[PDB]
Amino acid sequence: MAKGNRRDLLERNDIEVRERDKYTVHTLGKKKNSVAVAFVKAGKGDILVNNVPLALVRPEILRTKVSEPIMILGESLFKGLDMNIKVAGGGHVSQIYAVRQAISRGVLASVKDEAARSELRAKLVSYDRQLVVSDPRRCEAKKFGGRGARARRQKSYR
């Protein structure tokens, strides 16, 4: 139903305006048609996805996948801050990965000391690179010889 590029999402008018102005940071993640927008501020360590905490995301098995950067970097920073994510686009898993990308990038922007930002980059990218750099590959078009992009209709010679 949701479309990702909608203006109602990128600005996150969901939040009320007096509260919309306390959020300093902004961030983006993506994977396939999925897009996630994060509004990071100052708090005491709370995260939300579509008005749902991080412990109760639904595929269940990937909860570790979204909690990864915390147990990597450490909980100190996140405990310092508080976040409110919102995602919209194709697929459960795509949404998972977009969300984790947004987490990581946003916490990267919270620090102002570039040196620490680079150190954290090295610390984190080594474990994985898709936590910072978006995956580029995307669904590809089909052709009229058959019912697939590269597969063809079966041919009968005799």
Partner: protein
Amino acid sequence: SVTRVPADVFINSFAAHLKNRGIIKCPAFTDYVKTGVSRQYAPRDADWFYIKAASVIRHFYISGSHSIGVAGLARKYSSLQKGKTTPHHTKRASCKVIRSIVSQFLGQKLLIAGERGRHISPNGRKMVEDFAEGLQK
């Protein structure tokens, strides 16, 4: 709030509460019906009505200011039709039962109308949330 608790425990706990507290009652036609043309046999539990009721009220609370029609709910309870030596197709659920449920809710003021459809009323929010917090522990 309600979304800070998993949907699975809330639904069944609240159904038991509802059935105890005489809020709703299963009519007579429940004794021999499916819940959709897509189905194939009847439900195995004797207390499926109250499960549906709880899922519905939760749906209405989630939306909030928005308004939900009956058929729109019935598109959330769809399934797939099989057994036709033909590619399967998705079909919509039933509407009589949904209609009965919303009517029963509305007769109690838990649910209020509008220009189109219905939406939750403040009393509904009160009770839903208080029950959720009670089961939070």
